Design a protein around this motif. Sequence first.
Motif, mmCIF file in Angstrom:
data_model
loop_
_atom_site.group_PDB
_atom_site.id
_atom_site.type_symbol
_atom_site.label_atom_id
_atom_site.label_comp_id
_atom_site.label_asym_id
_atom_site.label_seq_id
_atom_site.Cartn_x
_atom_site.Cartn_y
_atom_site.Cartn_z
ATOM 1 N N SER A 1 0.830 -1.205 0.000
ATOM 2 C CA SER A 1 0.000 0.000 0.000
ATOM 3 C C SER A 1 0.868 1.260 0.000
ATOM 4 O O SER A 1 2.067 1.219 0.297
ATOM 5 N N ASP A 2 0.242 2.405 -0.288
ATOM 6 C CA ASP A 2 0.954 3.679 -0.220
ATOM 7 C C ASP A 2 0.473 4.502 0.978
ATOM 8 O O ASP A 2 -0.356 4.064 1.784
ATOM 9 N N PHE B 1 -1.717 -6.695 3.740
ATOM 10 C CA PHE B 1 -0.962 -5.638 3.079
ATOM 11 C C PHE B 1 -0.031 -4.969 4.082
ATOM 12 O O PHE B 1 -0.312 -4.926 5.287
ATOM 13 N N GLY B 2 1.091 -4.456 3.570
ATOM 14 C CA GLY B 2 1.964 -3.611 4.353
ATOM 15 C C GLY B 2 2.421 -2.418 3.535
ATOM 16 O O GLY B 2 2.291 -2.395 2.308
ATOM 17 N N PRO B 3 2.972 -1.405 4.204
ATOM 18 C CA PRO B 3 3.493 -0.227 3.484
ATOM 19 C C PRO B 3 4.565 -0.611 2.469
ATOM 20 O O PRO B 3 5.549 -1.281 2.802
ATOM 21 N N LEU C 1 -6.902 -5.865 4.357
ATOM 22 C CA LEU C 1 -6.302 -5.923 5.680
ATOM 23 C C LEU C 1 -4.923 -5.289 5.624
ATOM 24 O O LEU C 1 -4.144 -5.580 4.709
ATOM 25 N N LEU C 2 -4.629 -4.429 6.598
ATOM 26 C CA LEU C 2 -3.381 -3.670 6.648
ATOM 27 C C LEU C 2 -2.719 -3.921 7.996
ATOM 28 O O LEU C 2 -3.345 -3.722 9.041
ATOM 29 N N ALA D 1 -5.529 -6.876 12.075
ATOM 30 C CA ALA D 1 -5.214 -5.859 11.083
ATOM 31 C C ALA D 1 -6.276 -4.760 11.064
ATOM 32 O O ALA D 1 -7.421 -4.963 11.465
ATOM 33 N N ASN D 2 -5.876 -3.575 10.586
ATOM 34 C CA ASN D 2 -6.854 -2.574 10.172
ATOM 35 C C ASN D 2 -7.647 -3.105 8.990
ATOM 36 O O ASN D 2 -7.064 -3.462 7.959
#
Length: 279
Positions: free
Chosen positions: A183-184, A202-204, A271-272, A256-257
Amino acid sequence: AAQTNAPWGLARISSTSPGTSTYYYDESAGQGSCVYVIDTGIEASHPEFEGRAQMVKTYYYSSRDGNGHGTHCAGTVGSRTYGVAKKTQLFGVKVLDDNGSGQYSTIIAGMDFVASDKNNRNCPKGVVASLSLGGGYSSSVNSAAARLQSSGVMVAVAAGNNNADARNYSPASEPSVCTVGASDRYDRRSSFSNYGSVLDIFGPGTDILSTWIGGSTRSISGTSMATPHVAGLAAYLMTLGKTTAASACRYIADTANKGDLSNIPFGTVNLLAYNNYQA
């Protein structure tokens, strides 16, 4: 503990909303855990690793990171300023050459190496492996990642940068390991990030500042950058006793968020990665 003016990715995994600048985290910082960074190597000499990084295996005429990719990835796992798990032990396995490439037979061997070498190491809080690499679908590569996971290591792998379904890439498509999309900073799916049902989290991944070779730093983008966020978060959580290698991917998905990301295609998790730290 709090890190002022942290890279956006670190602030992101300790917040429920994008745009913040502090990374909040428990001071244990992954002490007692170990993360193997299976990549182009690690510049263990970098001051940001504070003596906590060492090469343990190379498949080429040198163990040096002549590329930077692996040093960057290791920095996001565990460097003092750019890392999620600031007290973890970092082990470098150089399966990629200094152009960032490697044969599948070498990557498989490096994975089997980690499964055994962890029995040579003091990692009382558990063991993680971060694989910011991949190519086209290989059953053999998928099996290698599944064996590493089965041996008692939390395996995190990059989804890939093809803006495509990760089912056609390995080890991204292996079901038993943790596959990480990018993700951004505005909680959009990264424009390059693969997607699909095989993703777990997902991660940054866009514009990630971390360590680079020559004792420097730089910002680059990729699912390669998101994967070490999740690997470091796992090591952080295993040190806190909140999960184990076998369950960390699910626990991270559990906590996760949820639903915060845009441009998530139908059938891909929203999911983040998030550390749910409460001071």
